[PDB]
Design a protein around this nucleic acid. Structure first.
Ligand SMILES: [Mg+2]
Ligand SMILES: [Mg+2]
Ligand SMILES: [Mg+2]
Ligand SMILES: [Mg+2]
Ligand SMILES: [Mg+2]
Ligand SMILES: [Mg+2]
Ligand SMILES: [Mg+2]
Ligand SMILES: [Mg+2]
Ligand SMILES: [Mg+2]
Ligand SMILES: [Mg+2]
Ligand SMILES: [Mg+2]
Ligand SMILES: [Mg+2]
Ligand SMILES: [Mg+2]
Ligand SMILES: [Mg+2]
Ligand SMILES: [Mg+2]
Ligand SMILES: [Mg+2]
Ligand SMILES: [Mg+2]
Length: 148
RNA sequence: UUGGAGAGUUUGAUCCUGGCUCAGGGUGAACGCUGGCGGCGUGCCUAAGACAUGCAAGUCGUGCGGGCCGCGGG
């Protein structure tokens, strides 16, 4: 099993004659607090199905984040559309310093020490993905040498 | 590398741009409601407007010559 957090749940709507009709959107991150996180956004005619379906995709999309004493190996900046995420290495005491969105991802990934900043569009969805694709580009001292 | 959190609000809904707004810290402060004690600070930011009264720069007889009161005594 995995540990799960609901980052976002939103109602959307579409028009047709006679009225508007809703659908729900569930941004869920899921992880083991020991180097494995997954982000999934799930939509359905009702709330919990969406939260379920979210969690489903969440697993069907993971990433192996190279923790290091609970911090990430290096500075990293990523832009997903107009959203930007900054990740910066932090020493033992620091805590996770971030907004909920990139927090929820970093805690459930087992980060315990990091400095972050959102820049640009701070739409949670895009920020979510931007933080994921960020982690996904983390490299270790090894990773680099093997590569080169 | 001791360091970096964001949120509300444009739409039926969306993403973006973009302003407004907020939570933080700060002060020679002021206003309200309330008000027990102590310590260290600290208190005319405006009229460099106008000020009653006291006080804030004096001292030396080991520079000099006198006055006035007294002490010692012809
Ligand atoms: Mg890896
Ligand atoms: Mg974006
Ligand atoms: Mg851009
Ligand atoms: Mg280091
Ligand atoms: Mg925002
Ligand atoms: Mg409005
Ligand atoms: Mg418009
Ligand atoms: Mg509205
Ligand atoms: Mg805004
Ligand atoms: Mg008062
Ligand atoms: Mg009173
Ligand atoms: Mg006093
Ligand atoms: Mg003055
Ligand atoms: Mg005048
Ligand atoms: Mg006058
Ligand atoms: Mg005096
Ligand atoms: Mg002399």
């Amino acid at each position: 099993d995995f540990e799960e957090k609901m980052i976002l749940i939103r109602r959307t709507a579409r028009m047709q004659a006679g009225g508007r009709r809703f659908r729900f959107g569930a941004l869920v991150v899921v992880g083991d607090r020991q180097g494995r996180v997954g982000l999934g956004f799930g939509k359905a005619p009702e709330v919990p199905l969406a939260v379920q379906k979210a969690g489903y995709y969440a697993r069907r999309n993971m990433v192996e984040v190279p923790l290091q004493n609970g911090t990430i190996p290096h500075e990293i900046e990523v832009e997903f559309g107009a959203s930007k995420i900054v990740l910066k290495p932090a020493a033992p005491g620091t805590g996770v310093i971030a907004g909920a969105v990139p927090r929820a991802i970093l805690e459930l990934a087992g980060v315990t020490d990091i400095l972050t900043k959102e820049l640009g569009s701070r739409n949670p969805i895009n920020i979510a993905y931007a933080t994921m694709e960020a982690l996904r580009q983390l490299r270790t001292k090894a990773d680099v040498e093997r590569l080169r």
